[PDB]
């Protein structure tokens, strides 16, 4: 339709923003513990999928918790300590989150450049309708 | 009459595009007020009903925020650009149609 380009770019921007927000939240909760109701904090990731309308935009179905084992730290003085006196610290890969943020920023800038070019082309298109 | 009927659809499309532009401007200007819900209108249904005030409905939130605001900047910007381009196209179509109707008188 020559106008689904805007939809594709907007979906890409929204997905990149979601992924960046997830990475930022993980970085903020890198060294947290004992969230609500006492359950240990676990990191989360996002999964990108394409919308087969062929070629289509990107979407994020749901946020998936990481299955990597939590860090078990010996500290009996914490009420969260089990019979072995261990507390469950969250699994956060700082380098992984930095790389994810870098990738999200680069994809966002590429998509905004594509939007700029297509907007210029579409503005120039209407000059022939007179 | 006939002259008004030949242009009613394009004129109403232009008017609805202007109203949707105003809605988008308002809900992009209120981007920081907590408790404010995003607003927009169903363009196709509105145009069909008017060709046969203005009905508006809330937008589905994208990500939660503690304050309560539910406006997404990139989505609003894309919608703004799309509506602006479609308004420009409608104006061009109306102008060409009027130019042809004027030209037929010579």
């Amino acid at each position: 339709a020559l106008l689904n380009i805007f939809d594709i770019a907007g979906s890409a921007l929204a997905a990149q923003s979601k992924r960046l927000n997830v990475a930022a939240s993980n970085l903020a909760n890198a060294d947290s513990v004992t969230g609500p109701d006492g359950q240990p904090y676990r990191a989360k990731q996002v999964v990108f999928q394409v919308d087969a309308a062929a070629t289509g935009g990107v979407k994020v179905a749901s946020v998936i918790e990481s299955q990597a084992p939590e860090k078990l730290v010996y500290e009996p003085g914490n009420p969260l300590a089990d019979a072995n006196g261990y507390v469950k610290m969250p699994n956060v890969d700082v380098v992984g989150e930095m790389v994810n943020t870098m990738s999200a920023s680069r994809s966002y800038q590429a998509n905004i450049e594509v939007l700029n070019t297509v907007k210029s082309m579409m503005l120039k298109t209407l000059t022939l309708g007179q | 009459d006939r002259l008004d009927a030949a242009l009613r659809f394009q004129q109403e499309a232009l008017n609805l595009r202007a109203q949707r532009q105003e809605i988008l401007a308002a809900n992009i200007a209120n981007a920081d007020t907590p408790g404010y819900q995003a607003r927009d209108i169903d363009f196709a249904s509105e145009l069909k009903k008017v060709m046969v005030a203005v009905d508006l409905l809330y937008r589905v939130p994208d990500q939660p925020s503690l304050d309560g605001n539910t406006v997404d900047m990139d989505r609003e910007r894309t919608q703004f650009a799309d509506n602006s381009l479609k308004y420009q196209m409608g104006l061009t179509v109306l102008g060409s149609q009027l130019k042809g109707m004027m030209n037929v008188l010579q």
């Binding site: 907007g10 929204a14 609500p36 109701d37 979407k59 | 408790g35 819900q37 927009d40 169903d42 409905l57 809330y58 937008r59 589905v60 939130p61 994208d62 990500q63 939660p64 925020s65 503690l66 304050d67 309560g68 539910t70 997404d72 989505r75």
Partner: peptide, 21 residues
């Protein structure tokens, strides 16, 4: 349903409980 679509009703208000009630 899908984010960014049109809905006739507002979403419930957001809250961030520090501790569960």
């Amino acid at each position: 349903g899908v984010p960014g679509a049109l809905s006739n009703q507002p979403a419930p208000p957001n809250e961030a409980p520090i501790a569960t009630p």
